Scaffold this active site. Structure first.
Site, mmCIF file in Angstrom:
data_model
loop_
_atom_site.group_PDB
_atom_site.id
_atom_site.type_symbol
_atom_site.label_atom_id
_atom_site.label_comp_id
_atom_site.label_asym_id
_atom_site.label_seq_id
_atom_site.Cartn_x
_atom_site.Cartn_y
_atom_site.Cartn_z
ATOM 1 N N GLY A 129 -4.057 2.105 1.116
ATOM 2 C CA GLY A 129 -3.945 1.646 -0.267
ATOM 3 C C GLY A 129 -4.551 0.265 -0.437
ATOM 4 N N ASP B 180 11.074 -2.664 -8.725
ATOM 5 C CA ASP B 180 9.968 -1.719 -8.973
ATOM 6 C C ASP B 180 10.242 -0.330 -8.374
ATOM 7 O OD1 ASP B 180 7.554 -0.840 -10.037
ATOM 8 O OD2 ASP B 180 6.289 -1.891 -8.589
ATOM 9 N N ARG C 167 6.423 6.510 -6.679
ATOM 10 C CA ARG C 167 5.233 5.941 -6.044
ATOM 11 C C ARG C 167 5.598 4.898 -4.981
ATOM 12 N NH1 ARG C 167 5.793 3.556 -11.270
ATOM 13 N NH2 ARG C 167 6.033 1.293 -11.064
ATOM 14 N N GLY D 239 -5.178 -2.931 -3.362
ATOM 15 C CA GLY D 239 -4.946 -3.569 -4.654
ATOM 16 C C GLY D 239 -6.063 -4.535 -4.985
ATOM 17 N N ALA D 240 -5.716 -5.644 -5.629
ATOM 18 C CA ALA D 240 -6.693 -6.691 -5.935
ATOM 19 C C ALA D 240 -6.675 -7.784 -4.868
ATOM 20 C CB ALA D 240 -6.445 -7.279 -7.320
ATOM 21 N N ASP E 97 7.647 -0.997 -1.000
ATOM 22 C CA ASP E 97 6.986 -1.678 -2.108
ATOM 23 C C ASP E 97 5.547 -1.986 -1.700
ATOM 24 O OD1 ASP E 97 7.025 -2.839 -4.768
ATOM 25 O OD2 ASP E 97 7.086 -4.827 -3.839
ATOM 26 N N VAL F 69 -2.743 -1.981 2.411
ATOM 27 C CA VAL F 69 -1.981 -1.363 3.498
ATOM 28 C C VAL F 69 -2.956 -0.582 4.386
ATOM 29 C CG1 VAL F 69 -0.199 0.356 4.097
ATOM 30 C CG2 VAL F 69 0.248 -1.300 2.294
HETATM 31 C C1 LIG Z 1 6.351 -5.056 3.754
HETATM 32 C C2 LIG Z 1 6.445 -3.760 3.068
HETATM 33 O O1 LIG Z 1 5.393 -2.918 3.225
HETATM 34 C C3 LIG Z 1 5.758 -1.829 2.495
HETATM 35 C C4 LIG Z 1 4.812 -0.750 2.497
HETATM 36 C C5 LIG Z 1 4.298 -0.293 3.689
HETATM 37 C C6 LIG Z 1 3.401 0.751 3.708
HETATM 38 C C7 LIG Z 1 3.015 1.338 2.526
HETATM 39 C C8 LIG Z 1 3.525 0.878 1.332
HETATM 40 C C9 LIG Z 1 4.424 -0.164 1.315
HETATM 41 N N1 LIG Z 1 6.929 -1.909 1.899
HETATM 42 C C10 LIG Z 1 7.382 -3.150 2.261
HETATM 43 C C11 LIG Z 1 8.689 -3.648 1.802
HETATM 44 O O2 LIG Z 1 9.540 -2.580 1.401
HETATM 45 C C12 LIG Z 1 10.653 -3.143 0.798
HETATM 46 C C13 LIG Z 1 11.842 -2.451 0.866
HETATM 47 C C14 LIG Z 1 12.970 -2.978 0.276
HETATM 48 C C15 LIG Z 1 12.900 -4.189 -0.376
HETATM 49 C C16 LIG Z 1 11.708 -4.881 -0.445
HETATM 50 C C17 LIG Z 1 11.631 -6.190 -1.145
HETATM 51 O O3 LIG Z 1 12.086 -6.013 -2.477
HETATM 52 C C18 LIG Z 1 10.579 -4.355 0.144
#
Ligand SMILES: Cc1oc(-c2ccccc2)nc1COc1cccc(CO)c1
Length: 297
Positions: A28, A159, A163, A30-31, A177, A35
């Site tokens: 993925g 959020d 997704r 973004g700007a 997230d 990931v």
């Molecule tokens: C560092 C990271 O990378 C991904 C991610 C990794 C791989 C793909 C997409 C996203 N999700 C996170 C955090 O997930 C959270 C969970 C709970 C609370 C919070 C903070 O509100 C964050």
């Protein structure tokens, strides 16, 4: 989680050497963030090569985004490990390289995309790899569990949506997230004014801009709708503007999705109650979905 500059980073526990991390193809973009799919040698198990997801910045990002990511790392450490929250495995924070936050790999990607792909392979009651009504209540239950955990660690998501739910092997779902790794400018889900996910936002967050655990309960109700429409986009046909909010402000809700049960739709309504305190807690949602899960099987 809003005062996270005081939270520690124990390098002797979390620092992963960059030379044991081999980067592959982006999952993925973004700007300012991305990931990346990676292979990490012996990160969680001695001498074991594991596929992982690396969250980092990209071309365009500044010192500001770097601080934000360092914050997300610190919060994940603080929160601790849970089945239904994307687990932290390590980090590269040493000077001379980019800040990399290394998390679990979730094979099947986000739940919105995945459920859409299974419209063709669904049957309410059981077809080797077919989804069922049980699978859906199970996902709902798991996310509620994960959210109860987050709530109890004195932090909120802000959020919550399909997704931002990922699907691993053996039907484990995990809250995450993408944050800066998602392109909010080109994503239809984020309407212009900041780019905000208006269809998932509670009235008090839209009008008063108050973020609480109870406004996440609202968003959870919208996620339920996504799960039980098998990944359909919320408020179909309806265009999100100034006059879309006033209807919500006086009690207009989405109709029942195509795959819901009566109790499940009622649970969406409970989550979408006008008064934030009148919405059920995540602790109550875990018990209730646990009951519905038992009533299904
Ligand atoms: C560092 C990271 O990378 C991904 C991610 C990794 C791989 C793909 C997409 C996203 N999700 C996170 C955090 O997930 C959270 C969970 C709970 C609370 C919070 C903070 O509100 C964050």
């Amino acid at each position: 989680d809003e005062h996270c500059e005081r939270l520690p980073y124990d390098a002797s526990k979390w620092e992963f050497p960059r030379d044991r991390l081999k980067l592959g193809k982006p999952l993925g973009r973004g700007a300012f963030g991305q990931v990346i799919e990676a292979d990490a040698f012996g990160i969680d198990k001695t001498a074991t090569c594991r596929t992982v997801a690396v969250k980092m910045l990209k071309e365009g990002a500044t010192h500001s985004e770097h601080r934000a990511l360092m914050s997300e790392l610190k919060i994940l450490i603080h929160i601790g490990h849970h089945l239904n929250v994307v687990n932290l495995l390590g980090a590269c924070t040493k000077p001379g390289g980019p800040l990399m936050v290394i998390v679990e790999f979730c094979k099947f990607g986000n739940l919105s995309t995945y459920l859409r792909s299974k419209r063709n392979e669904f049957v309410p009651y059981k077809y080797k790899d077919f989804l069922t009504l049980e699978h859906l209540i199970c996902y709902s239950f798991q996310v509620a569990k994960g959210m109860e955990f987050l709530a109890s660690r004195k932090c909120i998501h802000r959020d919550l949506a399909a997704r931002n739910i990922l699907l691993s092997e053996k039907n484990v779902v995990k809250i995450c997230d993408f944050g800066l790794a998602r392109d909010i400018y080109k994503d239809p889900d984020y309407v212009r004014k900041a780019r905000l996910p208006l269809k998932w936002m509670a009235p008090e967050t839209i009008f008063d801009r108050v973020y609480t655990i109870q406004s996440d309960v609202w968003s959870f109700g919208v996620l339920l709708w996504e799960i039980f429409s098998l990944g359909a986009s919320p408020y179909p046909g309806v265009k999100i503007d100034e006059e879309f909010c006033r209807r919500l402000k006086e009690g207009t809700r989405m109709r029942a999705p195509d795959y819901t049960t009566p109790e499940m739709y009622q649970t969406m309504l409970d989550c979408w109650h006008g008064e934030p305190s009148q919405r059920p807690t995540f602790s109550e949602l875990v018990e209730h979905l646990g009951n519905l899960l038992q009533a299904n099987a």
